[PDB]
Symmetry: D2
Subunit: 255 residues, 4 copies
C-alpha cells in the first residue's frame, strides 16, 4: 500500500467507533506499522486489544497533562523504533459545563486552561518531544472541527481550543518544515455515533449535515481514515500547514 | 459625534504611541466618555495622566491574571457608571522566548498557559464580569493580528493565542447577541514604533508592508482608532462576530 | 458629519427599500453631496424623485453593458464635479433561470456571460473610467453576498459572479492604492423585503437568519447604509481590499 | 493501485512539464484508464504521443469556446466508455495584456469575457455535458492558484476568473452531490518551469516560495499529481467542495 514501511503512532483510540480507529484501519491496510497510546492503567487491557486488531503489541501510557509522561512516551517508543514517520493526534477534552449551553456560563479560568492544555498544547508538545526521532519525511496529523472556524451551538470553549490547535498546525509546519516534516489537520464532520456522557446530543447536527451537505450524507470513519492515511503518506508530500475538510462538503454550504 | 453619550472602558493604554491611545482619541473626539485600566501601583500616575488627556479621572487597577481584580474592576466602575456601552481589550502577553525565534524552542506548558490566559481568556473573562451592567446596544472590541490567520516569523505562541481570541469573538457574539450586544475584533497592521524590550524588531515587517500593501503605507494609530470608534458605535449595529482588517489591505496580497 | 465635502456617485438605486437607498441616506446625513445613475429612459422620472429626496439633481443614464455609456457617465459627471470621492456599485443581474433551482439547469454560456458582465465586470469597468477624476483619498464600494463564499440555494451563477467581484476588490485595491484610493465590499445580509419578480423567495433565508444569527435579527438598510458611509469616509483610511460582513454576524455561525 | 478500474478524462496536457502530465502519471500508476483532450488539429500528433505514454489511444478534440465541441467530446468518449469516473480540468487562458502589469491597463470587456469563458465557465460546462455518463462515485477536479484568494502581481484578470472557478466548485458540488459525485479543486503552487510566451516570469515567485514556504521548496508535478489522484479516488469519498492547497504550505505563511 501507499504507507509501506511507515511507522505511525496513534493517540486517542478509545473505541472502535471513533476516527482514530478508522485512521488506524486505513493505515494498517496501506502497509503502516502502528503503535498506540492510552490514558490510565485500567484501560491498558482495552488498548492492547485494539492494537492487537492492527497487528500491534506496541502500547504506551501517556497522560498529556504530564510533561514527564510525554517525554517517557518517546523514550519507550524509541526502544522499538529508531525513527517515527507519523503521529496522529486525536486528543481533546473540556469540562462538561464548558461545552454545554451558554458559552459564558461554562467559562472559568480553570475550564479554559484545561481545555487549551489538553486539546491544543498537547499537539505541539508531542511534536517537540518526538522531534529528534522524526524521519525527514515524517507527517504529523491532528483532528479538528468546524467549530474552530465558525460558532456552533454547545461547542463553546472547545471552539477556542481548536482554533489555537489549527494555528499550531501552521506554526509547527514552519518550525519542522525545513527538515522536511509536514503538519496538517483534518477538520472532520460528525460521525454517526451516540455522544459520550456529558457531551450534548449530535442528533440535530447529524440530521442537519445529512440534509444540507453537498453529498447529503454524514462522513464515516472509513472516509476520515482514508483521508488521514493520505496526509500521513508520501502521496501528500506537497501538502503542509493545511486544514483539510473531510465532512461531505458541509463547511462549504449555508444550510 | 457618532459616539455621543457612549461610555467606554479601555484596557492596555501603556503609551501615547499605541493603538489603545489612538482608539481613545477617536472615541473622545466623537463624544464618548472614557475610563481606563492599569496594571501595577507604580504606573497609576502614568495612566492618570493619559486619562486626563481625554478628560477622564476614571482609572482602575486590573491584573487580568486575578479573578478578584476582574470582578472588582466592574464593581468600582459601576459606582460611577450605571451602564457600560463599550469595552476595548488591548491586552496581550507572552514570555519573551515564546515569541522569538523557533516556535518549538519557546514552547513550554507554562509559556503556553500564560500566553493564552492573558491574551485570549482575559477577553471573555472581562465580558462575563461586565455583562450585568452592559447596555443592550453595547459593543465589545478586541485587537488581533494577521499572525492568528497565517504563520508570521517570531509570532509563534502569540499566533495560537490570537487564534483562540478571534474564536472567542465569535462565541461571545452568539452568547451576548440575543441581548443586542456586539463583539468584534480589529486585525490591525503593525504601527511605526520601536518594538518593546524582548519583542523582536518590527523593522522588516514594517518595510515589507509599506512596499507590498495595496495602499503602500503602514497603518497609523489614527486609522486603527477611527475604525475602532466605528465598531464601538451604533453606526456598526449590523456588524458582529467580525474580524475587521485595518492594515492598509496587507492581508489581501501575496507580497 | 464624517463625510463633509465628499462627493459620491451611487448606482443601483431602484427603490426606497434597497441597500443603495440606505447608503444614500446615511451619506447625505453625514454631509456628502450625491449623484445617481439610472438605466432606461422610462425610469429617469423615478431616479430624479429619489435623488431629489437627497437634495440632488445630478442623475445620469448608464447601462453598464455599453462601453460608450460608461465613458459618457463620467464625462457628464465631470461637467459638475471636478473630482469624485466615492463610488457605490450596487448593480447585479443574472437571467432568472441562472438563479433558480439547480445550478446546472440554469447554466448556459450566455447566462454565465451576462451574469459576470453585469455583476462583476461592471465594477472595475466603472473604476477604470472614473480613475482620472478620482480624488487621492477616494473610496470605491461594492455590494456582495455570502453566496460568493459558500454555496447558498438558488444563488447559483450569481455566486460565481460575486466571487469574481470580491476578487476584483482585491486587484482594484492594488491597482488604485498607490494613488491612495481604497476599494472594499460589504457582504450584506438579506433585507426584509419581498423578492423581485423572477427571484426566489427570501422568506426561508430571512427566518433562518433571524433565528440563527448572533444578533437574532435581520440586518436593515440603515445598518448596511451606515457601514457603507463609514467605508466611503476618511474614518476608514486604513481599510482597503476588505470584504466586510454587515449581516448581524450570520456568516460566523453554523445555523 | 487506489484507482483500479477508474476511467478518467484529462484536459490541458500541453507538455510533459505541466501539472496535468503529473496527474496523468500518478493516475496511470494507481490503475486508472485514461483519455485526453486537445485543441487544434496541428497538435493531435503531440497529444497522441503523450497519451501513448500512459497506454492510451483515446484522444479527442475539444475547444471549450464551442458548445458543439463540448457536446461532441462526450458523445465520442461514450462510444468507448459507458461511464466516466473522473474529469481533470486544467484549462485556463487570458489575453497577455490581461495578465501583465497593471490590472486596469489590461482590463477590457472582451479580455474579461474570454478569461472567464475559458477559465471558469468551461469547468461546469464540461461537468454538465458529462453528467449523464458520470458514475455515481465520479470525481471532478479542477486546478486553481492562490491568486484567486489574494492579489498576486500580474495575475490580474485570471485572479477574478479563478475566484469564479472556485465558487463553481462549491455550486457544482451541491448540484452533483445528491447523486454521489464529488467536485474539488487543487490550489497548486508554481512549478519550476519556464513561463510560456506572454506570461510574466515565475522566477521571483519561485524563489520567494522556496525561501518562505514551510517546506522551503517548490511543489513538483509529482506532488500535485499524487494529490490529484487522491481526490479522484474513493480514498477521498468524504471530500467535496474543497479547495486543497498543494503548495508546500506557502498559502499559510506571511513571507
Amino acid at each position: 500500500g501507499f504507507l509501506d514501511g511507515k511507522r505511525i503512532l496513534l493517540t486517542g483510540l478509545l473505541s472502535n467507533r471513533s476516527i482514530a480507529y478508522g485512521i488506524a484501519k486505513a493505515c494498517k491496510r496501506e502497509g503502516a506499522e502502528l503503535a498506540f497510546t492510552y490514558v490510565g492503567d485500567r484501560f491498558k487491557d482495552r488498548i492492547t486489544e485494539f492494537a492487537a486488531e492492527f497487528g500491534s503489541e506496541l502500547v504506551f501510557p501517556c497522560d498529556v497533562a504530564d510533561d514527564a509522561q510525554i517525554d517517557a512516551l518517546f523514550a519507550s517508543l524509541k526502544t522499538h523504533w529508531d525513527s517515527l514517520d507519523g503521529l496522529v493526534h486525536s486528543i481533546g477534552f473540556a469540562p462538561r459545563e464548558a461545552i454545554a449551553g451558554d458559552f459564558l456560563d461554562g467559562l472559568t479560568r480553570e475550564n479554559f486552561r484545561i481545555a487549551h492544555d489538553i486539546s491544543a498544547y498537547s499537539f505541539p508538545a508531542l511534536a517537540k518531544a518526538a522531534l529528534p526521532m522524526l524521519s525527514d519525511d515524517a507527517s504529523l496529523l491532528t483532528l479538528s472541527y468546524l467549530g474552530a472556524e465558525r460558532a456552533i451551538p454547545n461547542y463553546n470553549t472547545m471552539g477556542l481550543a481548536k482554533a489555537a490547535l489549527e494555528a499550531s498546525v501552521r506554526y509547527l509546519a514552519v518550525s519542522l518544515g525545513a527538515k522536511g516534516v509536514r503538519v496538517n489537520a483534518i477538520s472532520a464532520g460528525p460521525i454517526k455515533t451516540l455522544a459520550a456522557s456529558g457531551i450534548k446530543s449530535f442528533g440535530k447536527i447529524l440530521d442537519f449535515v445529512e440534509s444540507n451537505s453537498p453529498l447529503k450524507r454524514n462522513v464515516t470513519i472509513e472516509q476520515v481514515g482514508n483521508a488521514g492515511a493520505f496526509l500521513l503518506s508520501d502521496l501528500a508530500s506537497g501538502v503542509t500547514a493545511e486544514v483539510m475538510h473531510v465532512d461531505s462538503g458541509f463547511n462549504a454550504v449555508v444550510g
